[PDB]
Amino acid sequence: YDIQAWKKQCEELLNLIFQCEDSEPFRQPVDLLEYPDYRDIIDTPMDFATVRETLEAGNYESPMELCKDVRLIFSNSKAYTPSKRSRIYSMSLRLSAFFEEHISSVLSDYKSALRFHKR
Ligand SMILES: COCCNC(=O)N1CCN(C(=O)c2cccs2)C[C@H]1C
């Protein structure tokens, strides 16, 4: 019932993600010179460094907010990829499954802790 536990859990999960080779394309903001049409397609850029920074700044209130930004990384990748058979797309899908598998208990524990708090 620890309401704050999510934060270290998410720090640990981001560490795992940074160790995953599949995260390499998603670790830094897209270079807008290198992909000059990016912002024509993507309204809200997001990357794992930004997520980690936001977390470490104390600018997430909940794991749900972190989970929304991480999912945006994957939706951005999926939207910019020209093919479902692309390398980056395939990496997105794998990393997303890994993330979703690990974030599920973080979310459940948090929501459970909050419910207990308001019981
Ligand atoms: C020669 O192969 C290069 C392959 N790389 C790419 O196509 N990209 C990098 C990933 N991406 C994204 O949307 C995001 C990067 C950060 C977070 S989401 C798509 C695109 C810019």
- What number of CA atoms fall less than 13 Å from residue 75's CA on the CB side? 11
Resolution in A, one decimal? 1.4
| CB within 8 Å of 1: residues ≥ 6 apart | 112, 113, 116, 117
Residue 77: how many other CB atoms lie within 10 Å: 22
- Ligand 1 centroid to 82 CA: how many Å? 11
79, 84, 87, 92 alpha-carbon torsion, rounded to 10°: 60
**Contact yes or no for 23/95 (Cβ under 8 A):** yes
Dihedral, CA of residue 72, residue 75, residue 79 and residue 83, to nearest 10 = 140
Q: Establish whether residue 76 lines the binding site of ligand 1, counting it when its CB lies within 6 angstroms of any ligand atom.
A: yes
Q: Cβ(49) to ligand 1 under 6 A?
A: no
The alpha carbon of 25 and the centre of ligand 1 are apart by a number of angstroms equal to: 6
Ligand 1 in reach of 77 Cβ (< 6 A): yes
**Do 67 and 104 meet the contact criterion of CB atoms below 8 Å apart?**
no
* Closest by Cα among 50, 71, 52 to 8: 52
Q: Where are the domains of the chain?
A: 1-119
**What is the position in ligand 1's atom list of the atom closest to the CA of 73?**
18
Task: Phi first, then psi: give them for residue 112, nearest 5 degrees.
Answer: -65, -40
